[PDB]
Each structure stands twice: as C-alpha cells, then as structure tokens.
Design a protein around this nucleic acid. Structure first.
Ligand SMILES: [Mg+2]
Ligand SMILES: [Mg+2]
Ligand SMILES: [Mg+2]
Ligand SMILES: [Mg+2]
Ligand SMILES: [Mg+2]
Ligand SMILES: [Mg+2]
Ligand SMILES: [Mg+2]
Ligand SMILES: [Mg+2]
Ligand SMILES: [Mg+2]
Ligand SMILES: [Mg+2]
Ligand SMILES: [Mg+2]
Ligand SMILES: [Mg+2]
Ligand SMILES: [Mg+2]
Ligand SMILES: [Mg+2]
Ligand SMILES: [Mg+2]
Ligand SMILES: [Mg+2]
Ligand SMILES: [Mg+2]
Ligand SMILES: [Mg+2]
Lengths: 173, 191, 107, 141, 203, 244
RNA sequence: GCAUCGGUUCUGGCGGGGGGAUAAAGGCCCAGGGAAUGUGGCUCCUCCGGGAGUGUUAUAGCCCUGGGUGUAAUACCCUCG
RNA sequence: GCCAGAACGCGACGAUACUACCCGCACGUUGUAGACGUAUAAGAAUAGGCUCCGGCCUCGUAUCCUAGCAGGCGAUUCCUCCGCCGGCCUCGAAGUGGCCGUCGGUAAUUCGCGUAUUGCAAUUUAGACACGCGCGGGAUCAAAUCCUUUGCAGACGACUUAG
C-alpha cells in the first residue's frame, strides 16, 4: 500500500525478580502506527518469550528519508511462502527513497510470484554505495555511460468525452 | 526484461545503390533489381556512415529482438544476389531405371518448365514450372546434373526444392529405394 | 437584413429515469446537457429551469402545444449528467427527445 | 554507393533536454531513473514557467526542441540556474511555435461580450476587401 | 459532446467490437449513425482464430425445421457488423426496435454518402489501441471464405470513385492557392489600423 | 438404442421442396461463361416435343465389346419452327446483384405475342403497343436511338427477346411463348449491333446448334395428383396382416 | 414568480492556532575529508565521427561529517472561526 | 452446376375508363421515436506524413456564416453576397453537379424618422416531409373476375388453353 518507516521499542513488564528488563528495537514498514505496533508483537513472538499481555510499548517514531531528492540503488533480502515450502530471494530496485522500494517490492512479488502481503518477511534493506556491487542485469543497463533513448509510438491524449473526431490522429509526439 | 537498445549494421559496396521508403527496400546493381517489403516488422533504418546502413530496435522484448538479426541477413542476401548471383546443383540417383529429363525453353513467357520421365519405370510424365527469373540448364561438365541460377536466393532455392519434392517413392522402404533427384551444392555464379 | 437566429436557451436530451438495475423511479429524471463534461462545469446549471414542449391534437386556448415545467436538482455521476424534477413525471416515451434549458435564475 | 533512407527521427530523452508539463511549466532533465520516470527541475524567474524539483512521469511531458549543452549529470538547483540564465532558455522558448499558439489561445478565452461584438464588425471590414481582390484574380484566371 | 443531425463514420481501421459499443450507446440517446466501408473493419488476433469462431457459428441450426427459428447466418461485412450491434440493444421491445431504425450500414460508399464529411472514432482506432507486434485480420477477407459473392464488384467501384476524387482534389488545391494570394494582397494595401486591433484580440 | 442393420436413406434431400412449379414454361437459371474472343452467337432455343422412335447405327469405341458392330438406341424428336427476335435488354453490375435498366422493342408486333399480354383477348381492344409504336417516325426515332446508345455505354451483358410461331404446329393453342436469350460475343458494341439487326426476322435452329453437340434440356416433368409414401419416396411395404 | 427567515442536507472558496528530529529536504555562507559512469589540461590513436590512458577542480560538477542564517518555508495529522 | 424464391426484399417495360394521372397556387381539418446556423467530400502511412517548394504537423481550443419592427420607411454610399426561373453540358452503386444569361433582394462607411401599454417571468404557436381538400389548365377514352370450354392439370380451390 502506501507505507512509511517506523521504529518501535518494546519491553517485558518489570517484576520484583527482574527489574529493568532488556529493550528491543525494530524497523517496520506499515501504513500507520496502529498496525506498526501489531507487526512488532508478531515478529517479537518468534524470537523471545514475550507477548502483548505481558509486555508494553516504550516508544514509536517515524524515520524519514535523509536525501529524498537523490537517485540510488537498493537491495532487499527476503523470505516468503510458496504454495509448497519456503524460499529466500534477493532483488534490487532503483529509486529515490527507502520507503518506495518496499512499495515496489510488494507489488513486484505479487505479480511475478503471486505472493500476498500475509506471507512475506523482510530481512534487510541496504543502499548500494558503489556501482560495481550491482548484480542483476536489469539495473546494469540503467547505469550505462551517456544514457539516452527516444520514445517511439506514443498515443496522444484525447478527452474521453469527445467522441467523433474529425481527422486522423498522429503518433509522432 | 526489455532491452533499451539493440543495433546491427550492413556494409554496402561501392558498386550499387539502395533506397528504403516506408519499409520497402529496393536494391539495384549491375546484375538487376530486387524488392522486398518489411512492413510487418518495427525497425528503424538509418544511414550510419557514407557506406554503412544501420538498423535498430528500441525498448524491445526478447522475442522482438530475435527478428533483428533475421532482417539483417535477408537484406545482405539481396546485395549478394545482385552483384554475384546464386547457383544450385542437383544429381540423379537411380539403381535400375534411368531418369530422363527435358528442360524445354521459355513457354511464351519468362518461365522455364522441366519434364521428368521414367521415374522408377512409371508412365507418369510429371511437369514443374520454375519461378520467373530462374533459368534451368543441363550441365555439360559431367553426367546427370541440373544447374539452377538466378538473382534471388528465395526463388532459386524454392524452385530447386520443388523438383526434389516431386520425385517420391510410395509404399516402399525408402532406406532401400534411394531413387530420386537431390541437391548437392550451393554457391554463387561469380567465383 | 438580420440573418441571425433567435435562441436564448441550451438544448438537452432526456435519457432515462432514475433506476437501479431492475427498479425504476419515475419521480426524477436524468438529462444530458450539451457541451458539459465534468461535474465542475455542471455546477453552473444548478437551480435553472427546463422545459419540455410537444404537439397535441386538439386546440384549447389558442394553441396546440403544451409545456411541462421543471428544474435542475443536483449533478449525477462524473460525466456531467444532471438530475431534474418536473411537476409531472415525463411521458416515458420521450427517451431520446429534446428539452430546453433556460437561464432564468441568473447568478 | 548511393543510399537513400526515408525514416522518422524522434527527439531523445537525454540530460539537459527541457520538457513542457501539462500546466504550461518547463523543467530540465538532470537524472534518468527508469524508462518511464526522470528527475527534473526548472529554475525560472517568471513565476508562470517555474517548477519545483522532483520526479515527473514521462507520460505527462512533451519534448521541446531546446537542449542545454554540457549540463553535468545530477547537478543541484544552484548549478542548474547558472546554465539556465546563460543559455537564455526563457527567451528561446518564447519564440517557438508552441508558445505562440498557447498565447494566441489565452487571448480568446478572455473576451467580453461587448468585445465579442467588436471583433465581428472588424472582421467584416477586412473580409470586404478580401472578396474584392479575390474576384479580380479569379476573373483574370 | 455535440448534437448533429446525422454523422457519417468511416469504417476503415476500426475494431469491430469497440466501434459497436460506441454506436449502440448513441442510437439509444437519439443520434443517427451511418457506417460506411464495412468491408475494411478489423478484428484482433490471427485470421485463423476468426475463421474457427465463425465455423462454430455455422453449426447451429434448428433440428426439426431449418427454414424457421434457426439462427440465420448472414455473410456480408455490413451484416456481420449489424449482428454485433444488435446484441447490445434490447431489440425485442418497441424502444429497442425504434433505435435500430436510426442506423444504416453499407459496403463501399454509395452515391448519397460520398461528397460528405466522414468522422473517426478515436476510442476504436486500431493504430491507437493494439500493441505493436500483435496480429489482426480484416472483416472483408473473412466474408470471402463463408459465401460473400460481391467482393470484386465492390473493389472495382471503389477504384472509380477514388479516381473521380483525384480530380476534385486538384480544384480544391487551386482554390486554396488563389485565396492565399488575395489575403496577402488585400491586407497590405487597404486596412490601416484594423490589423493590430484584431491581432490584440487573438485573431 | 441404435439401429439394428444399416441401410441408406430413401430419396434425396437435394430436390427437397416437392411443390408444383411456379411457372409452366421451363426457366433457365445460368448461361455459359462469356468469352470476348469468339464471334457473336446465341446460346439457346425452344420448341415442342413430338415423341420417340428407334434408330440403328454402328459403334466406334476401340477396346469395347461392341466395337464395329450395330447397336439399337432410342431417340426423341423435338418440333422446332423458327423464332422471331423482338427486342433486347441490358444489365449492369451492382453490389446487390444484376439488374436491368433499359429495354427496346421492334416497331411491329405480331398478333401471336400480343395474345400473351392478355387474359381475355377476345373482348379486349388490342392496344398493347399502340402508343409505343409512335416513338418510331418521330424526330427520326430519336427516343429509340437514345436507349441503344445507353446500353453500349453502361451494360456488361446483353440478352435478346424472342418468341415462337405456335401457329405452325398442330397445337390448339394460339398464345405464343416468350423468353430471353443471352448473346455471347466479342464486345458490348458488337453484341448490340448484332442484336439490333435481327429485329422482326426469323432465325432457324440450324444456325444455333449443329450436329453431334452435347446440350441440356430444361422442362417441367409429368404430374401425378396426390400420392402416398410408397410411390413418392419408395419405402418398403408393411406385412400383409397390418391393421389400419 | 421574487424578497426576508425557520428545520434538514449536499457542495465550493478564504483567514488563523498546535504538534514531529520544534518535520526531513532545499537556497546562500563557513570548516574538514573523499571518490568516479574523471571536467579542464597532458600523452597516444583515429580525420571518419571520435576512442583509450593518466590524474582529484582548474575553463564543469557530484558524494560524506559538524556549525550558522532559524523559533526559516512547505507536505502530512489535529483544531478555532 | 442443381432444387425452393422473402407471400411486409428489389429492378426494367406495356396498356390505364372512373379527375384515379400531370402542371399552377389556395387554404387546412390531419399525420411524425422528436428542426430552432440541423453550415463543412481528397486518398494513404502511423518505426511517418502535408506543401503555395519558402516551409509546416501534440491539439476541430479549428474554418465558414453571424448587427437592422420575428428585423420598418427614406438618404449618403457600394459592385459585394444570396434566391427563384431559362438555355446548353454532365451524372447509372440507390444517376447528380457545373457553366452562361434575364429578372428580384442586399450596413463594407455614415445618418434622419418609427418602436412604449405584451403593464416585473409564463413555447419565441415560425422548419421540411408526407396526406387530405379548393379552384383553373392539360393529357387520356382501359381492364379483371363470374359464366361456357379444354386435359399438357386436378381431392375441392388453383394451373395449361379457347370464346
Ligand atoms: Mg510392402
Ligand atoms: Mg445441417
Ligand atoms: Mg417464414
Ligand atoms: Mg433399435
Ligand atoms: Mg392424372
Ligand atoms: Mg420402385
Ligand atoms: Mg389383426
Ligand atoms: Mg435555508
Ligand atoms: Mg503551521
Ligand atoms: Mg581526460
Ligand atoms: Mg549539511
Ligand atoms: Mg539561527
Ligand atoms: Mg528548525
Ligand atoms: Mg518551522
Ligand atoms: Mg416474392
Ligand atoms: Mg368516385
Ligand atoms: Mg441586380
Ligand atoms: Mg380542377
């Protein structure tokens, strides 16, 4: 959907035997902070013996892109469920922010592999600092020197209410 | 995965002229003229240098790019045919019954006609008419040869295949009955 | 001399009633005004008056032509069609006829 | 070796090429993201032509014949403005046929009812002198 | 939108099913439509696909009596287009029957409907809808392999009217050339101040 | 369940609508394909049927059993008095078929043809072509020569109107029969010129046909009133002990 | 039919206030450090457009860290008219 | 090729008494799936086109027409635009357009008289197709069925013939 990145911090409820428990922090992509907390309890239930009934939320914040006007390449590590078994992949994207890559990845996996949102786990997102660490060949072509290309056969835009044109259109925009 | 730029080039020798208009190619040289229509393929033609023709495809798929090399060699074949021609040879293969042919001359039109008699001792006289621009000759170099020559590879080759496909044995083991006429060599008229 | 015409109204067509998929309500109608495309342009004609004129057979008070009066109520859809309400529901045989849209309550 | 080719030639999507957005705005391309999106901005003194910095889809843009030479790839807003004024982009675009057509349109949507009557009477006066010359040439044949 | 008395549509280059949807809506609104050159329409997909679709159509016929009730398979290009439109109109009611009376279809250009302006529907043009590289066919060819008999007659007549129109173009070209010289000659000589007054108004 | 033993169907569905013919005179539906390199010639004739008889001749069919031996064959005789040409017609090609646009008649018509246009000729006034005849000898027949010029310009096929002389047969009937015969020839100008020169003249059958030529015969068969299935289609009769 | 009001409701435009990294960016200015899809120079090849190499701002510019102008502007969320 | 021929699909021709047919204008009982500027003819390509050969093309957001009592009466002015008739050419896919000529009308410029009262809105009863009528002009003077008869036909009608 339309996402944005959060950080959320949780804690086991303090007790007389264990005052000052440990603190855990995650980065979660979610449409809003109501479901940002819900995903935190889901991921934490698979790593530590903590529930929502016996825990509490310390802080939730919003992380914004540092340079949302610079183009950069990203790489994503993820796991998902197929119709039989689980698998690991690693894909790449080219855009300006961290948030849109997760948006692009979710739409990409839904089309090529029929994978829904229910069955995708995000492991790590890292911005590729150099240019020789780009692996996939559909991004290597977009970083070639002196890139330029034309746009042949592009349909002109005509109002959808204007029927019965009086002359033949042209496709040389 | 769509490829941004795929390009090929065709050199042109300093003997002939070529003109392209609305994806219709006309090649004219010392030995004649040929035309081909390529309106079914989306290709962009251009003049790279003083004697080099370039062609390319933008934002094409894997299937679309495949046709790019097919177009290049077809046009190159046209250039070769108008300056060097083509030449095919055929041989007669029989065990007992000799095969007799009669390449009669032009039949009031440019077409040649070939008559084949006494195939495996049959009473059919079977007749095939060649495409225009193709001339059929009986060789004098050695025995049992048919020589086909012309300007266009497509017409010469298809007509040669017409002769081979007409001499067929039916209801017999074809590993034993090797009777027929077969093509044996392909080349140009010059050199 | 004076070759110009005499027109002070905008022409429209009577399309159909207001309906679901199997039920129709003759109380209100739908009218397509000529030259209006979006719902922003259709806001200009809210509250105007529309007329439907037709030919009868008998003469009553010096004429053979009757009129039914109505006015525009609200826009309809995203294509500039509008709703209208008349003193009597339209004759239901005029699906494709023409109506006149005035400009009386101006500005 | 005569070669004659009659084929089309489009305008390239390069760096320094200036687009024309839908609402009459100009932007210079500084970075190519995909085959569908680019990063562009236009620093213009005229508030009508100026546009902010951001990403623009290529399906809502038109390619104008103006191209800025030697624009470094990925330049900042400050460096783009220096080349924008040096090349005289604002003056170059004003004299194109696309600009004149837009200006000729704008004068027409703003016409008073009294002014619409005025242009009808003036057209007839010019139309009268046209038919006099047309008949003279047609008669000569 | 606009209301004309009658509109004439040139059929060459239009997809069969997309043009019929636009037409069927206009007829029920109150418009009058005339479709010309129905033999030059188009269908998406390879020709062999269309032929198999029609052959399956030909197999339907009433069993106990083929002279009544059975689907009658018309073979003309105008009749194929007419069948497509008839499926998008409630033709079993008086309102639907009246709508169909506002439609006329022909092969070629009959004498009443040449010397007329022919419109184009841009939401059904092939060059603006189909993806380059795909395959299409022509309705005219499909009618040939099902029993249409007057293909060559229409081809000959169309060559005659296009030759007549070539001479009409020469007269039209001459008239425009003469009108241009009049405007250049008249405007300079006479009008002292009407020019810039008109120019500031956008004319 | 399936049919026990197989057998072909009775009758044919090609000649299916078994109703009385619409018209007594036989109707020709197609003519031989035109060839513009042959000389102009007619392609049909029409006569009355007399009877049959027997002939004897010797056979020339090499390799046969009866080669060079006498055979006995049956033949049929057709009475054929000469026909008279009356007029000609022209057709044009349209996207809906063929249609006729003009026709011209001869100046004088016999009383045989005029009987055809009436159902009670005896008490009529016999004014069939009286006003049409005045088109001749009026402006030197300008109206007639105008239509002939039209056919030379717009038409593609030309036919001729002819009738029989039934008065030269032992028949009681006095009403003649009329039909159209197509002219297959070199050119449309040649077709009309040849056709126009034959007005009110007789033509004999020896000019149309010639010996040992293969022809076709069109007519209406002998009638029977109203018959059951056994004779009409030819089905097997039911056993002798069948009720009803 | 119009003007002035009452009940219900749909739909446009304008002026303010609060919050978050007291938005993040961004423009101009100051200090330090880097690199390549290496600008200008310099070397070589190609005259046939140009290509290859060297090397850190010069006759183009970009990236990273800290500070000033700042309680900057704007987006999103909430709220008084 | 061959068989049937839509009984609500179409064309050519013959003779047409009774005003049924043709021409002129005169009104209007009467009809209609719906006039209100009902104004616009190249062909062809769309990974190419148009042209006045100088150039032009995302865009019909265009072009033509458009003032006066529902549009009067005169004048100063101006050779434009429109219409009814007539004669020569032309048009066959379901036959159309062009040229010439006589006559009637006419703000491109600038003025003089007339408009009220329909009373503060109420269709602006105005278009062209048919059809029924009324005059006064022209041309025209026909057939079909029953009945008697035939057997190339037949349950009865119908069909092929004769009077
Ligand atoms: Mg064997
Ligand atoms: Mg069947
Ligand atoms: Mg029926
Ligand atoms: Mg059984
Ligand atoms: Mg009998
Ligand atoms: Mg039998
Ligand atoms: Mg019994
Ligand atoms: Mg209120
Ligand atoms: Mg604020
Ligand atoms: Mg260097
Ligand atoms: Mg900083
Ligand atoms: Mg500060
Ligand atoms: Mg701050
Ligand atoms: Mg602030
Ligand atoms: Mg019939
Ligand atoms: Mg009477
Ligand atoms: Mg006059
Ligand atoms: Mg009278």
């Amino acid at each position: 959907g339309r996402l944005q990145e959060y950080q959320v911090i949780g804690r086991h409820l303090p007790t007389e035997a264990n005052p000052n428990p440990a603190l855990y922090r995650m980065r979660i992509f979610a449409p809003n902070e109501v479901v940002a907390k819900s995903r935190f309890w889901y991921f934490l239930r698979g790593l530590k013996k903590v529930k929502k009934a016996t825990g509490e939320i310390v802080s939730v914040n919003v992380i914004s892109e540092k340079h949302p006007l610079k183009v950069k390449n990203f790489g994503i590590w993820l796991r998902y469920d197929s119709r039989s078994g689980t698998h690991n992949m690693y894909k790449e994207y080219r855009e300006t922010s961290r948030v849109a890559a997760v948006e692009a990845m979710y739409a990409d996996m839904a089309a090529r592999h029929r994978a829904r949102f229910r069955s995708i786990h995000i492991l790590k997102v890292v911005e590729l600092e150099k240019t020789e660490d780009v692996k996939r060949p559909y991004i290597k072509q977009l970083v070639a020197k002196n890139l330029s290309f034309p746009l042949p056969h592009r349909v002109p835009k005509i109002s959808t209410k204007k029927i019965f044109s009086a002359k033949r259109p042209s496709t040389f925009s | 995965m769509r490829y941004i730029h795929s390009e090929e080039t065709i050199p042109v020798p300093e003997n002939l002229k070529v003109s392209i208009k609305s994806r219709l190619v006309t090649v004219e040289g010392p030995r004649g003229k040929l035309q081909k229509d390529l309106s079914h393929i989306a290709v962009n033609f251009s003049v790279v240098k003083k004697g080099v023709i370039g062609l390319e495809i933008h934002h094409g798929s894997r299937k679309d790019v495949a046709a790019l090399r097919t177009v290049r060699t077809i046009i190159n074949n046209m250039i070769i045919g108008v300056t060097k021609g083509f030449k095919y040879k055929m041989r007669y293969v029989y065990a007992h019954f000799p095969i007799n042919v009669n390449v009669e001359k032009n039949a009031e039109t440019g077409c040649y006609e070939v008559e084949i008699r006494n195939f495996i001792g049959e009473k059919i006289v079977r007749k095939v008419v060649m495409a225009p621009g193709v001339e059929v000759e009986i060789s004098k170099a050695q025995k049992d040869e048919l020589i086909l020559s012309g300007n266009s590879l497509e017409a010469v080759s298809q007509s040669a295949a017409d002769i081979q496909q007409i001499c067929k044995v039916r209801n017999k083991d074809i590993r034993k009955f090797l009777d027929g006429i077969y093509v044996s060599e392909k080349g140009n008229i010059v050199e | 001399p004076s070759e110009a015409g005499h027109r002070l109204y905008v022409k429209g067509r009577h399309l159909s009633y207001q309906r679901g998929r199997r039920n129709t309500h003759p109380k209100t109608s739908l009218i397509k005004i000529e030259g209006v495309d979006d719902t922003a342009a259709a806001n200009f004609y809210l509250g105007k008056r529309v007329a439907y004129v037709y030919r009868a057979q008998k003469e009553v008070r010096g004429t053979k032509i009757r009129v039914i009066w109505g006015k525009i109520t609200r826009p309809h859809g995203n294509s500039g069609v509008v709703r209208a309400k008349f003193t009597h529901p339209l004759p239901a045989r005029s699906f494709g006829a023409s109506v006149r849209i005035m400009l009386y309550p101006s500005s | 070796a005569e070669i004659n080719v009659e084929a089309t030639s489009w305008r390239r999507v390069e760096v320094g090429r200036v687009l024309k957005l839908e609402n009459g705005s100009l932007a210079a391309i500084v970075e190519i993201i995909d085959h569908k999106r680019v990063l562009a901005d236009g620093p213009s003194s005229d508030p009508k032509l100026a546009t902010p910095r951001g990403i623009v889809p290529l399906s809502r843009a038109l390619l104008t014949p103006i191209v800025i030479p030697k624009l470094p790839r990925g330049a900042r807003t400050g460096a783009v403005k220096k080349a924008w004024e040096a090349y005289g982009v604002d003056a170059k675009w004003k004299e194109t046929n696309w600009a004149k057509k837009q200006l000729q349109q704008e004068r027409r949507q703003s016409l008073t009812d009294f002014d619409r009557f005025k242009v009808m009477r003036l057209k007839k006066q010019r139309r009268f002198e046209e038919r006099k010359a047309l008949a003279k040439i047609k008669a000569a044949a | 939108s606009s209301f004309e008395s009658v509109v004439v549509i040139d059929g060459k280059g239009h997809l069969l099913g997309r043009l019929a949807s636009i037409v069927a809506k206009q007829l029920l609104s109150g418009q009058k439509i005339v479709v010309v050159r129905c033999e030059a329409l188009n269908i998406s997909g390879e020709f062999f696909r269309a032929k198999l679709k029609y052959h399956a159509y030909l197999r339907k016929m009433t069993r106990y009596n083929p002279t009544r009730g059975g689907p009658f398979h018309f073979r003309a290009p105008s009749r194929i287009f007419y069948k497509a439109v008839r499926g998008m109109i409630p033709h079993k009611t008086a309102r639907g029957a009246a709508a169909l009376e506002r439609l006329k279809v022909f092969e070629g250009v009959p004498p009443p409907y040449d010397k007329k302006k022919k419109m184009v529907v841009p939401q059904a043009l092939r060059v603006l809808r189909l993806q380059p590289g795909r395959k299409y066919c022509t309705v005219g060819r499909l009618s040939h392999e099902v029993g249409w008999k007057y293909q060559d007659v229409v081809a000959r007549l169309e060559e005659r009217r296009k030759a007549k129109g070539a001479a009409y173009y020469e007269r039209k070209k001459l008239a425009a050339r003469q009108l241009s010289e009049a405007k250049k000659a008249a405007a300079a000589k006479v009008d002292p101040k009407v020019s810039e007054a008109l120019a500031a108004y956008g004319y | 369940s399936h049919r026990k033993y197989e057998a072909p169907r009775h009758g044919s569905l090609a000649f299916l609508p078994r109703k009385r013919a619409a018209r007594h005179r036989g109707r020709v539906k197609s003519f031989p394909k035109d060839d513009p390199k042959k000389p102009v010639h007619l392609t049909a004739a029409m006569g009355y049927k007399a009877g049959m008889t027997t002939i004897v001749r010797d056979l020339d069919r090499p390799g046969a059993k009866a080669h060079k031996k006498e055979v006995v064959e049956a033949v049929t005789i057709i009475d054929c008095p000469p026909m008279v040409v009356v007029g000609l017609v022209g057709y044009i090609e349209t996207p809906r078929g063929l249609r006729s646009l003009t026709t011209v008649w001869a100046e004088h018509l016999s009383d045989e043809v005029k009987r055809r246009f009436y159902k009670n000729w005896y008490k009529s006034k016999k004014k069939a072509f009286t006003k049409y005849a005045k088109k001749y000898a009026e402006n030197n027949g300008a109206s007639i020569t105008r239509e002939l010029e039209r056919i030379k310009k717009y038409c593609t096929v030309v036919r001729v109107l002819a009738h029989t002389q039934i008065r030269k047969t032992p028949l009681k009937q006095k009403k003649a029969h009329l039909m159209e015969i197509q002219i297959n020839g070199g050119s449309v100008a040649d077709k009309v010129e040849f056709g126009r020169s034959l007005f009110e003249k007789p033509v004999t059958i020896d000019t149309i046909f010639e010996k040992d030529e293969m022809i076709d015969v069109i007519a209406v068969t002998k009638g029977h009133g109203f018959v059951g299935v056994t004779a009409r289609w030819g089905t097997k009769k039911l056993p002798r002990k069948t009720h009803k």
